[PDB]
């Protein structure tokens with residue numbers, strides 16, 4: 001679950 005980078009772009 002590589003959501004680390006994903007969160008920076010999508011959520012934040």
Ligand SMILES: *CCCCC*
Pocket residue numbers: 004007008012
């Ligand atoms: C790892 C990212 C934490 C939320 C910004």
